[PDB]
Design an enzyme around this catalytic site. Structure first.
Site, PDB file in Angstrom:
ATOM      1  N   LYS A  95      52.388 -13.886  49.643  1.00  0.00           N
ATOM      2  CA  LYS A  95      53.812 -13.880  49.963  1.00  0.00           C
ATOM      3  C   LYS A  95      54.600 -13.908  48.652  1.00  0.00           C
ATOM      4  O   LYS A  95      54.048 -14.291  47.626  1.00  0.00           O
ATOM      5  CB  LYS A  95      54.184 -15.090  50.839  1.00  0.00           C
ATOM      6  CG  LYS A  95      53.391 -15.234  52.137  1.00  0.00           C
ATOM      7  CD  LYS A  95      53.775 -14.196  53.191  1.00  0.00           C
ATOM      8  CE  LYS A  95      52.769 -14.217  54.334  1.00  0.00           C
ATOM      9  NZ  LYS A  95      53.044 -13.202  55.392  1.00  0.00           N
ATOM     10  N   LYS A 110      44.576 -11.466  51.258  1.00  0.00           N
ATOM     11  CA  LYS A 110      44.911 -10.197  51.901  1.00  0.00           C
ATOM     12  C   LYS A 110      46.297  -9.649  51.616  1.00  0.00           C
ATOM     13  O   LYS A 110      47.239 -10.399  51.349  1.00  0.00           O
ATOM     14  CB  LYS A 110      44.689 -10.271  53.411  1.00  0.00           C
ATOM     15  CG  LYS A 110      45.517 -11.310  54.123  1.00  0.00           C
ATOM     16  CD  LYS A 110      45.363 -11.196  55.624  1.00  0.00           C
ATOM     17  CE  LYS A 110      46.060  -9.966  56.168  1.00  0.00           C
ATOM     18  NZ  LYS A 110      46.722 -10.477  57.349  1.00  0.00           N
ATOM     19  N   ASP A 155      49.700  -8.205  52.939  1.00  0.00           N
ATOM     20  CA  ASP A 155      50.447  -8.367  54.175  1.00  0.00           C
ATOM     21  C   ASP A 155      50.317  -7.058  54.948  1.00  0.00           C
ATOM     22  O   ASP A 155      50.073  -5.999  54.349  1.00  0.00           O
ATOM     23  CB  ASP A 155      51.912  -8.686  53.883  1.00  0.00           C
ATOM     24  CG  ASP A 155      52.429  -9.851  54.715  1.00  0.00           C
ATOM     25  OD1 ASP A 155      52.167  -9.886  55.932  1.00  0.00           O
ATOM     26  OD2 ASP A 155      53.090 -10.741  54.149  1.00  0.00           O
ATOM     27  N   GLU A 156      50.460  -7.118  56.270  1.00  0.00           N
ATOM     28  CA  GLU A 156      50.314  -5.922  57.097  1.00  0.00           C
ATOM     29  C   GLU A 156      51.210  -4.769  56.639  1.00  0.00           C
ATOM     30  O   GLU A 156      50.840  -3.603  56.790  1.00  0.00           O
ATOM     31  CB  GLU A 156      50.540  -6.231  58.584  1.00  0.00           C
ATOM     32  CG  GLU A 156      52.000  -6.454  59.019  1.00  0.00           C
ATOM     33  CD  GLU A 156      52.568  -7.803  58.589  1.00  0.00           C
ATOM     34  OE1 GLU A 156      51.827  -8.809  58.596  1.00  0.00           O
ATOM     35  OE2 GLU A 156      53.769  -7.855  58.251  1.00  0.00           O
ATOM     36  N   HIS A 209      44.311  -5.717  61.524  1.00  0.00           N
ATOM     37  CA  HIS A 209      45.585  -6.378  61.818  1.00  0.00           C
ATOM     38  C   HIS A 209      46.166  -5.768  63.084  1.00  0.00           C
ATOM     39  O   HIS A 209      46.170  -4.544  63.249  1.00  0.00           O
ATOM     40  CB  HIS A 209      46.572  -6.215  60.654  1.00  0.00           C
ATOM     41  CG  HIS A 209      47.728  -7.165  60.701  1.00  0.00           C
ATOM     42  ND1 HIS A 209      48.840  -6.952  61.487  1.00  0.00           N
ATOM     43  CD2 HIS A 209      47.944  -8.339  60.062  1.00  0.00           C
ATOM     44  CE1 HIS A 209      49.687  -7.954  61.335  1.00  0.00           C
ATOM     45  NE2 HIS A 209      49.168  -8.808  60.472  1.00  0.00           N
ATOM     46  N   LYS A 213      53.036 -20.322  64.594  1.00  0.00           N
ATOM     47  CA  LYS A 213      54.403 -19.811  64.789  1.00  0.00           C
ATOM     48  C   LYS A 213      54.513 -18.678  65.815  1.00  0.00           C
ATOM     49  O   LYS A 213      55.615 -18.333  66.251  1.00  0.00           O
ATOM     50  CB  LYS A 213      55.003 -19.360  63.446  1.00  0.00           C
ATOM     51  CG  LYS A 213      54.403 -18.063  62.884  1.00  0.00           C
ATOM     52  CD  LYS A 213      54.843 -17.796  61.452  1.00  0.00           C
ATOM     53  CE  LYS A 213      54.402 -16.401  61.008  1.00  0.00           C
ATOM     54  NZ  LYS A 213      54.571 -16.185  59.539  1.00  0.00           N
TER      55      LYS A 213
HETATM   56  O1  CAP Z   1      52.930 -11.690  58.281  1.00  0.00           O
HETATM   57  C1  CAP Z   1      52.605 -12.806  58.755  1.00  0.00           C
HETATM   58  O2  CAP Z   1      53.469 -13.511  59.319  1.00  0.00           O
HETATM   59  C2  CAP Z   1      51.154 -13.257  58.622  1.00  0.00           C
HETATM   60  O3  CAP Z   1      50.702 -12.711  57.357  1.00  0.00           O
HETATM   61  C3  CAP Z   1      51.006 -14.770  58.544  1.00  0.00           C
HETATM   62  O4  CAP Z   1      51.583 -15.275  57.358  1.00  0.00           O
HETATM   63  P1  CAP Z   1      51.707 -16.869  57.194  1.00  0.00           P
HETATM   64  O5  CAP Z   1      50.303 -17.428  57.089  1.00  0.00           O
HETATM   65  O6  CAP Z   1      52.489 -17.214  55.945  1.00  0.00           O
HETATM   66  O7  CAP Z   1      52.399 -17.441  58.414  1.00  0.00           O
HETATM   67  C4  CAP Z   1      50.292 -12.660  59.740  1.00  0.00           C
HETATM   68  O8  CAP Z   1      50.262 -11.264  59.551  1.00  0.00           O
HETATM   69  C5  CAP Z   1      50.783 -12.925  61.159  1.00  0.00           C
HETATM   70  O9  CAP Z   1      50.338 -14.197  61.555  1.00  0.00           O
HETATM   71  C6  CAP Z   1      50.235 -11.888  62.133  1.00  0.00           C
HETATM   72  O10 CAP Z   1      50.323 -12.410  63.436  1.00  0.00           O
HETATM   73  P2  CAP Z   1      49.081 -12.334  64.453  1.00  0.00           P
HETATM   74  O11 CAP Z   1      47.863 -12.934  63.786  1.00  0.00           O
HETATM   75  O12 CAP Z   1      49.418 -13.113  65.707  1.00  0.00           O
HETATM   76  O13 CAP Z   1      48.850 -10.889  64.806  1.00  0.00           O
HETATM   77 MG    MG Z   2      51.076 -10.443  57.495  1.00  0.00          MG
END
Ligand code: CAP
Ligand code: MG
Ligand code: CAP
Ligand code: MG
Ligand code: MG
Lengths: 93, 464, 464, 119, 93, 93
Positions: free
Chosen positions: C164, C190, C192-193, C283, C323
């Site tokens: 982040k 990783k 981020d998506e 993802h 969350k």
């Molecule tokens: O972008 C985000 O918010 C995260 O990187 C979490 O970051 P944090 O660890 O800082 O919260 C994940 O991609 C989400 O949790 C995806 O949701 P899911 O797994 O439900 O598909």
């Molecule tokens: Mg992410």
């Protein structure tokens, strides 16, 4: 081509519709009416700013007299979109 | 400096005094918060978790310039006629997005925010795609103008039939039905969306026999004919293998199911189509899974913008009057967003943002599903010329078969065109025009009699 | 013979006396009809328009054997606790589907039926995928067992951090954060998506610096390290170009956003991963657009089955406690469907059909989003060993930075493992185990203090 | 913009002074393969201008002599050395021979100084 | 490294210059000072909003005491441009 | 390895947990504990059907006496799933 042949009044009504929309009529002719033929031969130039549908029919008659063995069609185009917006055969040899 | 711990998203991500830039991507989200969550906090969570932010403060923010990268909610519009809803307007800087990637754009904006615990529901209603981002996309391989020029077809909607039954026909039987539809007066026939390659009919056999059918029907009628050969496939390599064979057979058009195959495969195919002069018909299979309900999902207008950017020459737009849902107000809006170069904001038609397409080619609208000859005047009036009108059962379900079925639809269309070009009101004189043409056409007469009583009239879910 | 015209779908497509074959694909649809539409007719419309039928009778049916190709509703289950809802059970013959094509399977079953005018809402709850169809798919490139063997990691969940802020970091800064996370005790970091390739950070620069970071952290710790390099891309060619570079850098693992990229691209990548010994982290970005609401869309368990078939070594499964929404009952069900070889029907966990996977490898569950050290005992207890637990803000938001942040999470996990292996009840002794370990770990102590009050407790939408 | 207008008879002279390239057009270009920030990160060099020498004489040196000059220039504290603009591939020095010997020089100078070197 | 070794006053003067420009100082350490080593190990966190150069020198001393066998350098970065704007070794083991 | 070193009672408690689950303990040794080393050398054979954790500890002691310069770990596997389900170092040289 799937409807009954058009009368002169119906043809003029189609042409007037084009003029009323602001489209520019043009007359072209070819020996064949096949759609694989990309280009027909243009009769003179497109009639820019013709407000009368009869003036378009006049050019069709003059084309027919010189080329009775050719198909003739009337086309109209939109210059702003630069596209042809109608095309229908007016004479089959 | 660095202050560790959780604070409210709104402290960083709600900026009511922000004026959007012409380079920003804008999003309009219909937000339904959980009870006790303030609108400003919900809107800020959406902005944050779709751009730069996470649930707690990170030190790494201070390595960069968070203020120029963050998304932000710049406006909140309460919806008093709704139950606990508001529109959040969110601005995203140009730099956040990968050039020419619909996939990346959607990953950011709709990736995670829809599952947030603090929301009950969330719907993406609209996106404003800036001109600077649009220039990074090819858009349609050809577009309306170029397609008409390639096909030499002008002045009327185009006509197609979907072969039925959906599945179960042999490749030879498939081609037979194609020849009969096409010779009868239709411009196009098509594979059903779910006809790919199966035990009852392998794709290469189909492609071959369809090519034979087109050649025969084109030679007999003197009109250019096509069939959307479905290249939708398990893998990208298989998709391109099928497209390449259609090219080898000199087929003018193929089809693709953009959502079930996905945007990465679709963008690949759209580029291939541009490179190869291939027309690309896009089927929107699966769209209603996401786009039907008012409270949650992604409106079709957004999916349609994404398709125009990724690229397609035709896209299904609904019928309004047929077996599948399509509110007229909502439909006319996204039809404009697909075809026009400049579309002014108009909330009455669901257009939340003014959209400039910067000369990106327009997409042909396709009206298909549960329509027949009686619907023709309404279809012509709603969609205009730059549309393809498709009749599956409405052709193959004709009392006398396929060729008459086709002629019935072709006569019906051409009569509706002539009448409109004579100044007649298609919404008033609709039934009269069809009845007038029926006298000259026994095919039409038979089609009219069979489907007189058939109407699809239900309350739409997706409405303004 | 041929009888033209419209008749009721139920006359052909509702077959309550049908017994499903072991080769049939079964679908469980939660159907909400429009008022005045009989359950049997709605269920028959769904069966018809997702298989062979259209709105009117076609002669071409008689060329084939419609009875052996048609889908059919074989059972209707009223839901009296709901408002105008029922479950339609539909059987589809094996021959309808393209071998190894998740894209084709979804196009048929969810292609058109969700937008039918005669329905108010429709949700696909479950699919029974027969063994004969499963054998046509590769499934995961590697699967749980092979992945653990490749990484030489056993006896505990794996740990990761998402870097982040989501967007805005330079490639060099990105790699710096990676080195620090990994050396601190995490197995994985990783992208981020939504980190693909952007103006602030181009993908090739990122891949290079991340590789440097892995090599340094692996050499320092003596543990095998990885970073899911995101290969999600505009086109299939670009996706594979990025995967190939990761391979050239000898990276053990990549990630892919399967829904935003799409199943065609994903199946291509999964085959490439198998061919190249590359681990594939999946993802699920965009899933909640489709899967959150009870009344409409596609349940995640179906999307999860589709991903297992297309192929992935890890997939995000939710956290339950973080969350983002994830009902515990619903989650435990689809976690089993992803990991196990044989899953018995169990409506209490949303398992509508018994699922035999025929030795198709299992997928690692990934718990991610809004989780921190206090959640560790619950995460271990819910998901077990064959999971990856990911902490983005929960690592980078630590008071002292990344390396301590990582150590805090690693200590917390290993303490939870030891305690569980001693026979202690993680749901009862949860807080005690964390507090016990905090004495030995100042990193953990600091993490605990910061996030003590942080809980995500809201009513879930997607519930049994 | 500059194709034909500079030779127009009706003009005596013409000079193009500046162009405003709009953001929308710029987004269609890659731009630099890396640019300032990324280059510094790749070379691990911060806080100062970079330093280079062009090998002289422009033309006439053998590949092996070229490499020797490169090693000496780089070991002495320069970040970069370079081919003269008109050094391509010629009878006195073929390009592949130059590339190989220059690579040898960079490897030796980099090992001895512990700083990243280039040519 | 091509100049005479810097005194504590010269080092603090270099650090103060960074602070005066609005740059953010950070301390890192490694077993080798070779430039082929991409990443050094970060000491704690970057000193955001330090107005005093002595506070930076304090962290250098604390790092030296814990790691006397490691090279130590001070770096500063511009967060707006997101780039490192200075780097010089302050201690050789 | 991120926890305090385990006592003999803690080690035996970990091993007993494996046995109670039906897993099969095995002892292996190597000169290095690095994870890049794919294979360690197996001590004798896996202890199939050992119900006593002390019997496992006995083999560890016998291995330690013969190889005091080697790392030793205890692993357990599930033969039905055919996967290793635990691994922890019991002796560092
Ligand atoms: O972008 C985000 O918010 C995260 O990187 C979490 O970051 P944090 O660890 O800082 O919260 C994940 O991609 C989400 O949790 C995806 O949701 P899911 O797994 O439900 O598909
Ligand atoms: Mg992410
Ligand atoms: O499979 C079908 O049902 C159709 O072939 C229509 O066949 P009929 O002409 O026989 O009805 C179309 O694919 C749907 O209309 C798609 O819906 P939409 O255009 O809304 O995406
Ligand atoms: Mg169809
Ligand atoms: Mg020179």
């Amino acid at each position: 081509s799937y409807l009954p042949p058009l009368s002169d009044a119906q043809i003029a009504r189609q042409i007037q519709y084009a003029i009323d929309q602001g489209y520019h009529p043009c007359v072209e002719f070819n020996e064949t009416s096949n759609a694989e033929i990309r280009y027909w031969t243009m009769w003179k130039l497109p009639l820019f700013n013709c407000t009368n549908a009869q003036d378009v029919l006049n050019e069709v008659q003059q084309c027919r007299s010189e080329y009775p063995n050719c198909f003739i069609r009337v086309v109209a185009f939109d210059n702003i979109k630069q596209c042809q917006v109608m095309s229908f055969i007016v004479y089959k040899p | 400096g660095y202050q560790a711990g959780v604070k409210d998203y709104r402290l960083t991500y709600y900026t009511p005094d922000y004026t959007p830039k012409d380079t920003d991507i804008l999003a309009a989200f219909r937000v339904t918060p959980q009870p006790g969550v303030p609108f400003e906090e919900a809107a800020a969570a959406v902005a944050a978790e779709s751009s730069t932010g996470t649930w707690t403060t990170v030190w790494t923010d201070l390595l960069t310039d968070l203020d120029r990268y963050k998304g932000c909610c710049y406006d909140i519009e309460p919806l008093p006629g709704e139950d606990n809803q508001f529109i959040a307007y969110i601005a995203y800087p140009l730099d956040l997005f990968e050039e020419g990637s619909v996939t990346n754009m959607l990953t950011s904006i709709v990736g995670n925010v829809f599952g947030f615990k603090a929301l009950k529901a969330l719907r993406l209603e609209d996106l404003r795609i800036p001109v600077a981002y649009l220039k990074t996309f090819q858009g349609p391989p050809h577009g309306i103008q170029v397609e008409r020029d390639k096909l030499n077809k002008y002045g009327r909607p185009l006509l197609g039939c979907t072969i039925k039954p959906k599945l179960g026909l042999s490749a030879k039987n498939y081609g037979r039905a194609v020849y009969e539809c096409l010779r009868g007066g239709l411009d196009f026939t098509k594979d059903d969306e779910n006809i790919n390659s199966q035990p009852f009919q392998r794709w290469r056999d189909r492609f071959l026999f369809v090519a034979d059918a087109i050649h025969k029907a084109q030679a007999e009628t003197g009109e250019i004919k096509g069939h959307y050969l479905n290249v939708t496939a398990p893998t990208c390599e298989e998709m391109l293998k099928r497209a390449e064979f259609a090219k080898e057979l000199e087929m003018p058009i193929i089809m693709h199911d953009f959502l079930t195959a996905g945007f990465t495969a679709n963008t690949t195919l759209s580029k291939w189509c541009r490179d190869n002069g291939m027309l690309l018909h896009i089927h929107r299979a699966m769209h209603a899974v996401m786009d039907r309900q008012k409270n949650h999902g992604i409106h079709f207008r957004v999916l349609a913008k994404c398709l125009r950017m990724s690229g397609g020459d035709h896209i299904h737009t609904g019928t309004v009057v047929g077996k599948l849902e399509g509110d007229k107000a909502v439909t006319l809006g996204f039809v404009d967003l697909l075809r026009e170069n400049y579309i002014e904001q108009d909330r009455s038609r669901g257009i939340y943002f003014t959209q400039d397409w910067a000369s990106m080619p327009g997409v042909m609208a396709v009206a298909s599903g549960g329509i027949h000859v009686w619907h023709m005047p309404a279809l012509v009036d709603i969609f205009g010329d730059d549309a393809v009108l498709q009749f599956g059962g409405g052709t193959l379900g004709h009392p006398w078969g396929n060729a008459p079925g086709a002629t019935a639809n072709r006569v019906a269309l051409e009569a509706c065109i002539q009448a409109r070009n004579e100044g007649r009101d298609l919404m008033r004189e609709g039934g009269d025009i069809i009845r007038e043409a029926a006298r000259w056409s026994p095919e039409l007469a038979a089609a009219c009699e069979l489907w007189k009583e058939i109407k699809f009239e239900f309350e739409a879910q997706d409405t303004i």
